Amino acid sequence: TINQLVDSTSPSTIGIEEQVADITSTYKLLSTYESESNSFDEHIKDLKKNFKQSSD
Amino acid sequence: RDEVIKKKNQNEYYRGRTKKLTIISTKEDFLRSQEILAQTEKSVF
């Protein structure tokens, strides 16, 4: 999307700052979701280890 | 991306307004009339 955004956008036309900012927020949100899932998996691993130790 | 390729092709309507295009006749037509002005009279007729 970045490459094609450079490819298409007319350098004489301004108004891409809002597009880039919105996709910036979107990608930060998506990276946040990925990080949430990563920490969720890490918490799952630690929780599983602790639960197994306590149950045993 | 597909529309990117299409719009790059539309920039290659560079030939689209460049290759298709005024004064070649204009420069020469002057020479045609200027040469023919000395050639030519209704008063004589």
| Residue numbers of B between 3 and 22 with CB closer than 8 Å to A | 3-4, 7-8
CB under 8 Å to A23, separation ≥6 — which residues?
A1
Size of interface A-B (CB pairs under 8 A): 11
Greatest distance between any 2 Cα atoms in chain A: 69
Query: How far is the alpha carbon of B1 from chain A, nearest alpha carbon, in Å?
Result: 5
Does the beta-carbon distance from B7 to A8 stay under 8 Å? yes
Separation between Cα atoms, residue A55 and residue A32, nearest integer Å: 33
Q: Give the distance from CA B30 to its chain's centroid.
A: 14
From B23, A39, A15, select the one nearest A31 (Cα to Cα): A39
The data reach a resolution, in angstroms, of 8.0
